Design an enzyme around this catalytic site. Structure first.
Site, short mmCIF file in Angstrom:
data_model
loop_
_atom_site.label_atom_id
_atom_site.label_comp_id
_atom_site.label_asym_id
_atom_site.label_seq_id
_atom_site.Cartn_x
_atom_site.Cartn_y
_atom_site.Cartn_z
N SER A 1 0.77 -1.26 0.00
CA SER A 1 0.00 0.00 0.00
C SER A 1 0.82 1.34 0.00
O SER A 1 0.23 2.44 -0.15
CB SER A 1 -1.09 -0.02 1.06
N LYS B 1 0.48 4.00 -2.82
CA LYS B 1 -0.64 4.92 -2.91
C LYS B 1 -0.21 6.36 -2.83
O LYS B 1 -0.77 7.25 -3.48
CB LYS B 1 -1.76 4.63 -1.94
N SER C 1 -6.15 3.50 3.15
CA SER C 1 -5.66 2.42 2.29
C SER C 1 -6.70 1.75 1.41
O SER C 1 -6.48 0.61 1.02
CB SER C 1 -4.85 1.35 2.97
N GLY D 1 1.89 -0.26 4.81
CA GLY D 1 1.40 -1.29 3.95
C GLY D 1 1.54 -2.64 4.60
O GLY D 1 2.39 -2.80 5.47
N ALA D 2 0.70 -3.59 4.19
CA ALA D 2 0.78 -4.96 4.66
C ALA D 2 0.44 -5.86 3.53
O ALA D 2 -0.46 -5.54 2.77
CB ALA D 2 -0.23 -5.26 5.73
N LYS E 1 2.52 6.69 5.54
CA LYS E 1 1.74 5.70 4.83
C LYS E 1 2.33 4.32 5.05
O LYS E 1 3.52 4.13 4.82
CB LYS E 1 1.62 5.99 3.35
N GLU F 1 -4.54 -3.61 -7.48
CA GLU F 1 -4.93 -4.11 -6.19
C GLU F 1 -5.92 -5.22 -6.43
O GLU F 1 -6.74 -5.09 -7.32
CB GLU F 1 -5.54 -3.03 -5.29
B1 LIG Z 1 -2.00 -2.38 0.38
O1 LIG Z 1 -1.10 -2.95 1.34
O2 LIG Z 1 -1.58 -2.70 -0.99
C1 LIG Z 1 -3.38 -3.12 0.39
C2 LIG Z 1 -4.31 -2.56 1.49
C3 LIG Z 1 -3.91 -2.55 2.99
C4 LIG Z 1 -4.44 -3.63 3.96
C5 LIG Z 1 -4.05 -3.60 5.46
C6 LIG Z 1 -3.13 -2.47 5.98
C7 LIG Z 1 -2.62 -1.40 5.00
C8 LIG Z 1 -1.80 -0.52 5.96
O3 LIG Z 1 -1.75 -0.84 7.19
O4 LIG Z 1 -1.23 0.47 5.48
C9 LIG Z 1 -2.99 -1.42 3.51
N1 LIG Z 1 -3.20 -4.46 0.90
C10 LIG Z 1 -4.21 -5.32 0.92
O5 LIG Z 1 -5.33 -5.04 0.47
C11 LIG Z 1 -3.87 -6.65 1.63
C12 LIG Z 1 -4.73 -6.75 2.75
C13 LIG Z 1 -4.09 -7.03 3.94
C14 LIG Z 1 -4.83 -7.15 5.11
C15 LIG Z 1 -6.20 -6.84 5.12
C16 LIG Z 1 -6.85 -6.50 3.92
C17 LIG Z 1 -6.11 -6.44 2.73
#
Ligand SMILES: *[B]([O])([O])[C]([C]C1=[C][C]=[C]C(C([O])=O)=[C]1)[N]C(=O)[C]C1=[C][C]=[C][C]=[C]1
EC number: 3.5.2.6
Length: 263
Positions: free
Chosen positions: A45, A48, A105, A211-212, A209, A141
């Site tokens: 994420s 973004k 996100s 991501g996971a 920002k 995505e």
């Molecule tokens: B992003 O990582 O590409 C996208 C959305 C996301 C989910 C959880 C947390 C964040 C953050 O903490 O910044 C961003 N990733 C996903 O959609 C994977 C996903 C992971 C866990 C829960 C839902 C989706």
């Protein structure tokens, strides 16, 4: 500070995975501290922010409108779309999609924005144009969070992401008005509370920002500083761990505490 490097290595030991790290002086561009600076990691994420930067550059060129509204359907909805799923009815403006993409996100909001600019290939061209010959966005995505070992798709290097964020934020690249707008969105981040925000002392500034993704991937990019003003850039990526979300967040917040301590 080298003591911070100790913590980054402590984290690699804890998570059983690699950890990429980087500290950048916001004003000079000077690299303060580093670790696995030139290895590739998945952006997840964190891309973004780059997306909205490209959107803002179009708006500056009058090629796009923040006020422009966009309509979409249930057909466009991807997993993890907290705001978007709420306005199937009224659609959303460019501005709101960026807000949603960055502060929450929102997956669908990212997908809609990518379309508007020309997709992954155009983002990559945008980045490459501004001096980043490494960072590449290949997918949409949410397949971009796959993180298959050794895959180069949709990755960055800590060094590359840091300097690019620096350019967006302080380069002549974006107008004053757009840079500001971008910072504003990051500052309002509503989902990174357990990460760096958790180690921040009162009065500090932070625009970030996170991501996971799959395979234990996690990361954050951020501009922070004391007394309401950012003065440094910190990028943190990790991939490959079998650790749970909490342990992953714990380690990252621990690196941030070290960063603060040795400021
Ligand atoms: B992003 O990582 O590409 C996208 C959305 C996301 C989910 C959880 C947390 C964040 C953050 O903490 O910044 C961003 N990733 C996903 O959609 C994977 C996903 C992971 C866990 C829960 C839902 C989706």
């Amino acid at each position: 500070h080298p003591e911070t490097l100790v913590k980054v290595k402590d984290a690699e030991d804890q998570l059983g995975a690699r950890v990429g790290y980087i500290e950048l002086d916001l004003n000079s561009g000077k690299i303060l501290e580093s670790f696995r600076p030139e290895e590739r990691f998945p952006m997840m994420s964190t891309f973004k922010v780059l997306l909205c930067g490209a959107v803002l550059s179009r708006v500056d060129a009058g090629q796009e409108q923040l006020g422009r509204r966009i309509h979409y359907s249930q057909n466009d909805l991807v997993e993890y779309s907290p705001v978007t799923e709420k306005h199937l009815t009224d659609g959303m403006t460019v501005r709101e999609l960026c807000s949603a993409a960055i502060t929450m996100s929102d997956n669908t909001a990212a997908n809609l924005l990518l379309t508007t600019i020309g997709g992954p290939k155009e983002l990559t061209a945008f980045l490459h144009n501004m001096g980043d010959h490494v960072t590449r966005l290949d997918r949409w995505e949410p397949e971009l969070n796959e993180a298959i070992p050794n895959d180069e798709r949709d990755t960055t290097m800590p060094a590359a992401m840091a300097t690019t964020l620096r350019k967006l934020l302080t380069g002549e690249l974006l107008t004053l008005a757009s840079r500001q707008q971008l910072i504003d969105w990051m500052e309002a981040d509503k989902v990174a509370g357990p990460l760096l925000r958790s180690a921040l002392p009162a009065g500090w500034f932070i625009a970030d920002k996170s991501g996971a993704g799959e395979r234990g991937s996690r990361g954050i990019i951020a501009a922070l500083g004391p007394d309401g003003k950012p003065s440094r850039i910190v990028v943190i990526y990790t991939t490959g761990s079998q650790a749970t979300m909490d342990e992953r967040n714990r380690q990252i917040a621990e690196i941030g505490a070290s960063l603060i301590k040795h400021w």
